[PDB]
Design a protein around this ligand. Structure first.
Ligand SMILES: [Zn+2]
Lengths: 190, 287, 191, 286
């Protein structure tokens, strides 16, 4: 990528979620290249230098999640530890998305637990974060307690983003179910 | 500093006090105050609305009575929830509910004290039923002339709020001001019962009385309006039989039709009221 | 200062209309309301004091307020004719104490019993354990004629609180002629 | 006196949102507040209201109190901002009034000559138009007992004026409006009919249950006269009720005759004109 070299003042105009997407494209163009993708970004790494851009450092782990989707490696736990470290909820935005997207289709267990205690941190913009993450890890599993807890957390919460993240979350858990899902589809539609 | 797309969570009690305080002052513009809680920058809620008394100075920053605020918040302390004040509102029944010079003259005071203090205006006149009407205003910071004036991010509620683009003179305030989105939160049980509360109009008063009052009249004296309807039969259909011949002269449709369609079909729907409710007599009279 | 809400209870029983307390118990308990309202005024400004009629029907005419002016107006022409009722007289002031806006004020009741009561010992011990659960401290001052050296009322105050609870004190009228000011002279200095 | 009251959705919600106020903290009893009425005429209208904290012991189920300073200066607040508004009474959420609710009205009779108490319902269930209205009146009795107060029921209706119409009419967003002539009258035939069935059913269930359990009185008084009013009209033919039959048949004559007339007119116009523009569009294009 020459992008940051060819366009500069446009990237200096970036503010708020712009630096999220800016460092998120870093992972879209680096999609694949599983080996050096972590160390090659050291200049663009999710700092966390604290003149807070913090949607920046959230989008950095988002970039690492876009590359690590489907199969993956210890970088998944590398993002998991950083989810348990640094700040909140700015890390969970793209970080938990990285944790859930990398475990997508793998039917990961501990992610469902540590995302429940992460879901209880009670914020708004992180609503879509844990919702899409928990929906990706459970893809095709058609589990029970996962949808039960996602539909049980939607009451006391005041945010509509946790409703939409859990909307696609309980939507993504069921794939190719045909008439098997219609039992829940009747309740969701009614 | 940081700016993000804003959403105003409103309570039905707030909107009720809004239009009620605005309807009692028509034509004269009144002055209220908004009550609620600031959760964060990108979301805000108004959980209550109370009205300020009208004074001789008119609508002005001095119209707010400090001893009224002290005694009201004390009356809110003995009330269940004593939430802190947030912002102000004033109704504009007589015109298109645009902020005047005094509205900004009190806005630098409300932005001084309170960080946000969103300004809301409401009018009964625009729509009698099917529109939110009301209005929304927030004063942009003049100290931001250095940086850019065009946030936010997550443009969803923003680009959808701008439309219609709200005329010219209103969006003439889009310079130095900007609107804010309003959504109705449920609270579905109360929204459903209050839904049926106004449905008592077109359904029935008790859901029993008014169409048992249609069992009171019940063709009474409802045939008098059938005699006027059959006079509309003779009237409208004697000129309706002149239409198809003229259609053969002018060859053919003048676009048209005169309409001069439907109508007494509804009179026959009252005949469905005739057959049904009179068939109830067999149930009423026998046991 | 100490935080609490004191609810004074005048005795409207028909036995309280006699002039044994000079010149009359009406003005005697009026001065009793005078000394309790002025002492609580000299105690804390945040103390609000209402009145309650114990005998016959229990109704508080003056909503709980720090100003005793309306209370002093109800002391006149009160028409205190009726049969003394005890069990309800404490609970009616307890409901008036649950209407307080501020919850930092302790619940306190002062009442005057000048008449023999038919209240059974089972009723006062049920109110005693009920006030134990509700923490309410009641300081009663016995006026008028009653059972000599009142027992069920003394056992009511005893069993009302404990450990310490510092506390509920009962002041009974001595068996001798005295002014009402001399009867209230002891409680105002020490409870 | 007071015949009927007009209860706007604003006052009802003003009680129910206070049922959220003290309902989040709970627990038992009911939401009681001061009712602000508007009297233009014998028909009563309601616009605004305000609620006051209230507690009632059970011990002592007859003990009740309100904050008069809240009633005083807030009335001074609401009368200030609006000079047309004044208190016509109080209200509570019931659902069924306990015998102690009388003395509340007797205390505020000094504020208003006649205070009408409005029972309301925070959770809609049955059977129909919610809440209730009771006016304070002394009817004595036909038995000459010392005068006692049994509140007479005032019929309550829901209405609005202008802005209160604007808010709720946009807030429905639920069912078709109306629609006039088709679904409207027949759904009302279901509701008013069936809710009239279970009304008198459960009410006649109380008629027999009160005789079975709850005596005395209970029965007397109005039982013998009210039940005979039920026995006023059985009411069947012969004779003149047979004449009303085919007379009603003679009434449906005209309307259904007109129905066939509209059928001929609608079929004539629409079918002829449509086939014209149809055959013409086909023969010209094809
Ligand atoms: Zn103005």
């Amino acid at each position: 990528d020459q992008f940051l070299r060819d366009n500069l003042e446009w990237l200096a105009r970036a503010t708020n979620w712009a630096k999220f997407t800016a460092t998120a494209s870093l992972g879209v163009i680096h999609k694949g290249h599983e080996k050096e993708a972590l160390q090659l970004m050291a200049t663009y790494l999710p700092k966390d230098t604290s003149p807070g851009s913090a949607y920046q450092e959230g989008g950095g782990l988002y970039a690492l999640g876009l590359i690590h989707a489907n199969h993956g490696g210890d970088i998944i736990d590398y993002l998991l530890n950083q989810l348990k470290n640094a700040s909140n909820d700015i890390v969970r935005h793209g970080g938990s998305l990285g944790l859930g997207l990398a475990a997508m289709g793998t039917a990961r267990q501990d992610v469902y637990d540590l995302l429940k205690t992460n879901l209880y941190q009670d914020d708004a913009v992180t609503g879509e974060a844990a919702g899409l993450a928990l929906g990706l890890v459970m893809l095709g599993s058609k589990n029970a307690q996962a949808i039960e807890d996602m539909v049980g957390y939607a009451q006391e919460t005041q945010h509509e983003k946790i409703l939409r993240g859990l909307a696609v979350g309980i939507a993504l858990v069921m794939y190719g179910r045909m008439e098997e899902a219609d039992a829940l589809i009747e309740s969701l539609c009614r | 500093a940081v700016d993000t797309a804003e959403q105003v969570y409103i309570s039905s009690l707030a909107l009720l006090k809004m239009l009620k305080h605005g309807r009692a002052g028509v034509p004269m513009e009144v002055m209220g105050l908004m009550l609620g809680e600031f959760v964060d920058d990108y979301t805000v809620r108004v959980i209550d609305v109370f009205a300020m008394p009208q004074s001789g100075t008119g609508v002005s920053v001095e119209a707010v009575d400090p001893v009224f605020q002290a005694k009201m918040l004390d009356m809110l302390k003995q009330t269940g929830r004593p939430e802190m004040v947030v912002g102000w509102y004033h109704s504009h029944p007589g015109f298109g509910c645009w902020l005047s010079g005094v509205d900004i003259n009190t806005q630098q005071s409300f932005e001084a004290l309170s960080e946000r203090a969103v300004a809301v205006v409401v009018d009964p006149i625009q729509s009698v039923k099917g529109k939110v009407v009301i209005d929304a205003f927030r004063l942009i910071n003049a100290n931001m002339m250095v940086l850019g004036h065009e946030p936010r991010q997550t443009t969803s509620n923003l680009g959808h709020l701008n439309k219609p683009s709200i005329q010219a003179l209103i969006h003439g305030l889009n310079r130095h001001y900007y609107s804010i989105t309003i959504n109705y939160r449920k609270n579905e049980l109360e929204q459903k019962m209050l839904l049926n509360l106004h449905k008592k109009s077109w359904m029935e008063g008790l859901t029993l009385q008014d169409y048992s009052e249609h069992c009171k009249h019940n063709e009474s004296v409802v045939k008098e309006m059938l005699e006027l309807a059959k006079n509309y039969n003779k009237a409208v259909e004697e000129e309706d039989k002149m239409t198809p011949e003229q259609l053969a002269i002018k060859n053919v449709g003048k676009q048209d039709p005169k309409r001069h369609l439907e109508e007494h079909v509804d009179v026959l729907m009252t005949s469905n009221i005739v057959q049904c409710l009179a068939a109830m007599l067999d149930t009423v009279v026998f046991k | 200062m100490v935080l609490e809400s004191t609810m004074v209870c005048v005795d409207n029983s028909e036995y309280m209309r006699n002039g044994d307390f000079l010149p009359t118990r009406l003005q005697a308990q009026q001065d009793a309301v005078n000394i309790v309202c002025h002492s609580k005024t000299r105690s804390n400004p945040e103390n609000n004091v209402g009145l309650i009629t114990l005998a016959n029907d229990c109704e508080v005419l003056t909503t709980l307020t720090p100003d005793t002016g309306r209370i002093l107006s109800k002391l006149h022409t009160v028409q205190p004719k009726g049969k003394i009722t005890f069990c309800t007289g404490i609970r009616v002031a307890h409901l008036a104490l649950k209407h307080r806006q501020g919850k930092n004020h302790k619940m306190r009741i002062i009442a005057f019993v000048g008449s023999p009561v038919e209240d059974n010992e089972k009723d006062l011990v049920k109110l005693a354990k009920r006030l134990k659960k509700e923490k309410v401290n009641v300081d009663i001052i016995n006026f008028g004629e009653e059972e000599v050296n009142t027992e069920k009322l003394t056992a009511f105050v005893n069993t009302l609180n404990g450990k310490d609870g510092t506390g509920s004190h009962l002041v009974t009228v001595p068996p001798g002629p005295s002014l009402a000011d001399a009867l209230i002279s002891s409680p105002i200095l020490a409870g | 006196a007071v015949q009927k009251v007009v209860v706007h959705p604003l006052v009802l919600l003003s009680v129910v949102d206070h049922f959220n106020r003290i309902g989040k903290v709970g627990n038992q009893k009911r939401v009681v507040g001061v009712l602000l009425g508007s009297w233009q005429k014998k028909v009563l209208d309601v616009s605004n209201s305000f609620a006051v904290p209230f507690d009632e012991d059970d011990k002592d189920d007859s003990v009740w109190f309100l904050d008069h300073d809240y009633l005083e200066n807030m009335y001074g607040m609401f009368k200030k901002v609006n000079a047309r508004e004044r208190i016509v009474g109080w209200y509570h959420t019931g659902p069924k009034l306990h015998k102690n609710d009388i003395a509340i009205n007797e205390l505020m009779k000094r504020y208003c000559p006649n205070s009408v108490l409005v029972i309301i319902d925070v959770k809609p269930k049955d059977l129909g138009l919610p809440t209730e209205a009771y006016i304070s009146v002394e009817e004595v009795h036909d038995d000459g007992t010392p005068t006692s107060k049994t509140f007479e029921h005032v019929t309550s209706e829901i209405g609005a004026e202008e802005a209160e119409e604007v808010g709720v009419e946009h807030l429905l967003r639920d069912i078709k409006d109306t629609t006039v002539g088709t679904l409207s009258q027949r759904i009302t035939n279901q509701v008013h009919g069936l809710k009239g069935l279970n009304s008198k059913l459960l009410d006649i269930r109380s008629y027999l249950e009160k005789v079975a359990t709850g005596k005395l009185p209970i029965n007397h008084q109005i039982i013998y006269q009210l039940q005979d009013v039920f026995n006023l009209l059985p009411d069947v033919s012969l004779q003149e009720f047979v004449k009303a039959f085919y007379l009603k048949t003679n009434d449906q004559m005209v309307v259904v005759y007109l129905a066939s007339l509209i059928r001929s007119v609608v079929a004539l116009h629409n079918l002829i004109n449509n086939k014209i523009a149809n055959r013409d569009a086909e023969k010209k294009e094809g």
